[PDB]
Amino acid sequence: GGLVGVLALAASYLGNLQAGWLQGLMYLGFGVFLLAVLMSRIWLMIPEIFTQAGHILSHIRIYAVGAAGGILAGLLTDVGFALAERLGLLGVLLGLLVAGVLHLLILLLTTLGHMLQPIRLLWVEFFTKFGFYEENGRPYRPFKSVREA
Amino acid sequence: AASGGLDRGLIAVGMGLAVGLAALGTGVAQARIGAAGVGAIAEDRSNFGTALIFLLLPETLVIFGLLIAFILNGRL
Amino acid sequence: AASGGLDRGLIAVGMGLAVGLAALGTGVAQARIGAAGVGAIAEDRSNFGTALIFLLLPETLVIFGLLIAFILNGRL
Amino acid sequence: AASGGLDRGLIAVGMGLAVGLAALGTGVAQARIGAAGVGAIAEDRSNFGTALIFLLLPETLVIFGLLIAFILNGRL
Amino acid sequence: AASGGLDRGLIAVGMGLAVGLAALGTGVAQARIGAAGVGAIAEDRSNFGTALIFLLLPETLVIFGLLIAFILNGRL
Amino acid sequence: AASGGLDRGLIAVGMGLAVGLAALGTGVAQARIGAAGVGAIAEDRSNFGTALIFLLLPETLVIFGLLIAFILNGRL
Amino acid sequence: AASGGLDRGLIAVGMGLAVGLAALGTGVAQARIGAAGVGAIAEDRSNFGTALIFLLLPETLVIFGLLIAFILNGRL
Amino acid sequence: AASGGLDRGLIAVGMGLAVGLAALGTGVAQARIGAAGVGAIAEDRSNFGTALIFLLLPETLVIFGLLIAFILNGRL
Amino acid sequence: AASGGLDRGLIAVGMGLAVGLAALGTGVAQARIGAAGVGAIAEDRSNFGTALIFLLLPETLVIFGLLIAFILNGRL
Amino acid sequence: AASGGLDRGLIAVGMGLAVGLAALGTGVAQARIGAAGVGAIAEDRSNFGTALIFLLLPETLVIFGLLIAFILNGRL
Amino acid sequence: AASGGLDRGLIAVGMGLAVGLAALGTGVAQARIGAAGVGAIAEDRSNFGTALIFLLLPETLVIFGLLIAFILNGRL
Amino acid sequence: AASGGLDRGLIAVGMGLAVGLAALGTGVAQARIGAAGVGAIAEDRSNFGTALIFLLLPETLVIFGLLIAFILNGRL
Amino acid sequence: AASGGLDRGLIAVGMGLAVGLAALGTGVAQARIGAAGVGAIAEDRSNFGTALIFLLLPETLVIFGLLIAFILNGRL
Amino acid sequence: DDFAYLNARVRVRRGTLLKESFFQEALDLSFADFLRLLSETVYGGELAGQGLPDVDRAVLRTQAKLVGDLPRLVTGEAREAVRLLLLRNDLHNLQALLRAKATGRPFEEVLLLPGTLREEVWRQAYEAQDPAGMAQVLAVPGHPLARALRAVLRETQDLARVEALLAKRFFEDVAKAAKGLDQPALRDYLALEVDAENLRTAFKLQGSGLAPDAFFLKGGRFVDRVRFARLMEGDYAVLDELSGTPFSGLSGVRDLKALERGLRCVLLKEAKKGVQDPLGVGLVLAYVKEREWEAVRLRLLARRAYFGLPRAQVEEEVVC
């Protein structure tokens, strides 16, 4: 129920100039739509929806990092074989080759770290009761065991 | 774009602090709760969802900081 | 940045800083209670809710910085 | 983005820091005690009313500040 | 107030900090003693006057600012 | 309030920091003795006048900030 | 190189705070959690993943710095 | 009141630091020892005089600062 | 060498900041883990290859410094 | 005297730092020894004397700025 | 190389900073890691070649300083 | 005397820093060893000729500082 | 008094800092290890041979510097 | 703080041993000679004349003066931890008081080991008639065992059952309490004790094989209710399945006496880990254990010597 208003606010920064005004103080009625049935069950612990919102920012962050750390990886071949030193010069190609053989193996080791992030993202989703039996235990084997091969 | 100045600078300045304050808080926070899990797992392998649950969580603070840091760009 | 105004700029820097310092407070806060949290499965399932509820409170720290951000600018 | 007068950038300064520093201190303070509390509930169901009296104290520090901060600030 | 040059603004800055810096200190102070406190009631009902009293003592630091500040209040 | 030089600005400001730095130090100081402190009352209810006399000593640090404040102002 | 633009300087400063703070934070976060582990390595070559798994979550922070640095680039 | 000038500010600042730096050190010194102190009194009412006599020593530090602080400003 | 404009001047500093700072981070990270590490060797020479590998990840900070120190000089 | 040049104040500055930083060191050095020291009396009245004697050493650190200062002065 | 223009003063300061900051970090690293080891050694004489290798790792930080300083000065 | 050269002001700060900081390092060395010590006095009455013999070698160092500080001046 | 113009003073600086910052690292290293180290002899007489090999490493930092201090002098 | 002092105090304390060779002689020492050997050693400082009750008494006092002093110091995290150890044996003593209290057996003949609570607490407790009142007394200074005793007492006032269910419940309290530190070594040794207690209890109860959990104390880490159960069913194969578990000298053992020996060795091997453990509780802990282990052999060998009993009679049991 909340979401339409989210899109409303988002646009003025999301295109900056491309959008922001296909919606507005749309939020004021959209926020009401959100909470209606949380309140119908009563729920003596309603504020707790805050944490459901936290996951969204996290999902973004994991992809972002998976990308950025990703990008960084390509750029080490660039400051490891290509251009960097001084303002960026030609002979850096083979000055860096002193380093060049070295950067390759280091790079290899670390990118393995990046792929655990796909799974970190996934782990956000897996125990968040979106068609799942685990919920910090609960009869059924962890998901941990399920995906590996 | 265009020559800097102290006002532009004031907004330019704050961008690192926003990410940094939030980032620092997530790491220290993660270090004690995060620390708690290896023994729990060891003792009770079944208990892992908790260990696993501790680490994700402080990290929301850093995400907020970065957002403030970003927003200043495109207003700087 | 902004309209300009070094004074306005001065009020602007700190509105964010208010948000950042609190974020730092919120994480550390989550960490000590989180440590209690490994304890929680053990102590009482009934109290588990309490432990969980205990976590809810620190984000308020943050709220003060943002109130200062809404109220301050636009106004300036 | 607008403007005010010369005063506001200067007057603003202690107002943010006041909310942020107290807030940071409050988060740590409340958290350790919040953690501490949990042994008492299991042990004594009775202490839950006590727990209700106990926890409150560091958070007050900010409230006085909002009152003064408004008389000073938002004074434009 | 919300009028005046930059210099007057400096006298304003530190008033919050007196209160704020002390506030940060009070929270940490409250956390160790407070932690000590929960057990004292919990085991010992008799200890309630002491425990209730105990948490208070660091808190004085902040308070000094409020009396002078209040007599000042809005003079500037 | 009042307007004048750069000199006036340093002294007016400083009244809080002097108090604040010491305050932060005192709070932690009182806290270690205090946490320990809760136990003596528990042990000897009888001792309570002694215990009451005992706690006091670290608290002096703040008072110096106030002493320097009496001297400094008058250029405020 | 040479005499940097007034603009380039504002962003260039803040460029450092992001890389240094996150990098430092990750190493320390890894170190405490890292410290707890060692008997397990000996015990179980297979179980090894848990201490290791612990380290991965903090790893996000540094990478965040690179993203904000990325948007700035060509203005710096 | 007072008036500015580049020379004066350096002396105006430092008088407090001499006292302040010592104050922080003294408090921490007392805190650790003070905590240790509390049992000795309780059993041995006799040990109370000793507990006090032991406790006293770090406070001298501040006084050194005061002599030096006095020496700085007089020029001002 | 000789005179430098604002970019060069800013970088000249940071070449040093970089070398000192990384070393500091590396040391702290190393202190907690390093303290933990040793008993295992005594027990197991066999695991020693694993140990030799074990210490390594925070240490990365120093190497980044040499490449950047190299890069800075030449915009210097 | 009066507002002299920048130098008298600047030269004045560094004298304090030596004394102050060292002062902080004395208190802490004394703190570890004293706290342990309270335990020493308890454990051994005969070992109480070493602790008592031990506590004395750190205070020299403050003095170190002053001996070089006495000889120097005739240039303030 | 001796007196010169605007760039040089900046490298000369920071050349020192490179050395100072790394030295503090190495020392801290040795203190915790170093402290655990000797009992292990007491048992394991066996480790002694290993002991020459084990201590060795934080110490690299110092070496890093000599190249950056030498190349900077003692080479410019 | 009084105000003088630009060289003196720049030079003056760090002379003090050299004398005070070395003092802090020597003091910390005493504090931890002292802490270990009362059980040690009991244990190792035996080391005293030796203990006495090591102790001698560093005290010469203190004199080197006073000298170096004395000799350097001629730029102050 | 002394010579004027900023540049020599600017070059002058790092020699004192070299003594202070490195000294904090040596002290922190010396204190924790030294307490175990003198002690190693006390329990374990065999460890005196070990102690002779083990303790030794921090001592290099000051002596190269005096040689370098000499090298530094000639820049100024 | 104060484990700077504690490990160090311990470092000196660890010296007053009566070496392995003491015990080896003792095999070959008559009672008089055994006594002579003892009088020249630290137990000798509590030995006046010659005679076994005196040896044993000397042991109590010897352990007392070097360790028993320590519970009054309670202030460090560690001191509290140490308090837990002592509390457990003492918990036995408390049981001895409770049981004494119930059968018209007087208060006066129940020796206590160095107590966190003084003589008068015990006296009051004894003197505080109702089972609630006795328990309430122990709580006056504070005693997690008081409250536990009460917790068990809340349902009925049946002394023996209260003691039994309490022992399980207390070791359950302990499980949390030991967890409430960290200073692992005590925790570890204790964990091995849980396993060990389970093995012996199952052993004591074997062939009963009822509802095992009433006798299975929880906190098994290589043992579980079923393994316990199986042994209690009489299935000895459990020890043969509890192999490659941390308890290897129990393998194939079919007697409790040898069982206790193996267990002592395993746990001892764990206790021995502490020798230069910092805040990590090992150096003091191990030291307490040394005094313990020494005491065991001395008393055993004292009798051996006294009655002239074989070398072979002590041979399994004065080594681990």
UniProtKB/Swiss-Prot annotation, chain N:
InterPro entries per the UniProt record, alphabetical: ATPase_csu/dsu_sf (IPR036079), ATPase_V0-cplx_csu (IPR014272), ATPase_V0-cplx_csu/dsu (IPR002843), V-ATPase_V0D/AC39_subunit (IPR050873), V-type_ATPase_csu/dsu (IPR035067), V-type_ATPase_csu/dsu_dom_3 (IPR044911)
One Pfam short name: vATP-synt_AC39
Gene3D superfamilies reported for this sequence: ATP synthase (C/AC39) subunit, domain 3, V-type ATP synthase subunit C domain
One Gene Ontology term of the molecular function aspect: proton-transporting ATPase activity, rotational mechanism
Keyword annotations: ATP synthesis, Hydrogen ion transport, Ion transport, Transport
Cellular component aspect of the GO annotation: proton-transporting V-type ATPase, V0 domain
One GO biological process term: proton motive force-driven plasma membrane ATP synthesis
Family: Belongs to the V-ATPase V0D/AC39 subunit family.
Function field: Produces ATP from ADP in the presence of a proton gradient across the membrane.
Name used for this protein in its record: V-type ATP synthase subunit C
